[PDB]
Write a protein that binds this ligand. Structure first.
Ligand SMILES: CCc1ccc(S(=O)(=O)Nc2cc3c(cc2OC)n(C)c(=O)n3C)cc1
Length: 111
């Protein structure tokens, strides 16, 4: 059965994906194209992996959800040079996504 909290996480995940207009963060960074990625990044994350986590009841709280979103952004800032589309997109996502999360955390607190 559905819970209000899990419904809120689903809603919030959709709102975050809407902010990623180019679908830069929809799926894992492809190791075939970026063969040194795991040399630098210890815990890859992306929205499809978050959707999998959400549906396996691994976000028992909001914190753990926000932490995975923040990894999407921090991994991208860490890996990519500043003068890239990826780095700029992660800065934009940090800005827009942070605002989605702040509002969503307020709703979570009422539960
Ligand atoms: C902007 C043109 C471009 C898109 C995808 C690629 S990719 O085939 O290398 N895929 C890819 C790489 C990513 C990436 C996302 C990618 O596919 C969308 N992110 C978030 C990231 O940090 N890296 C290094 C390369 C260039």
């Amino acid at each position: 059965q559905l819970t209000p909290f899990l419904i809120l996480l689903r809603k919030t995940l959709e709102q975050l994906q809407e902010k990623d207009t180019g679908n830069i963060f929809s799926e894992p960074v492809p190791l075939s194209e970026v063969p040194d990625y795991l040399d630098h990044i210890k815990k890859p994350m992306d929205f499809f992996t978050m959707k999998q986590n959400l549906e396996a009841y691994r976000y028992l709280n909001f914190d753990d959800f926000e932490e995975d979103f923040n990894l999407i952004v921090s991994n991208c800032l860490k890996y990519n040079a500043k003068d890239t589309i990826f780095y700029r997109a992660a800065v934009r996502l940090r800005e827009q996504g942070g605002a989605v999360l702040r509002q969503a955390r307020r709703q979570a607190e009422k539960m």
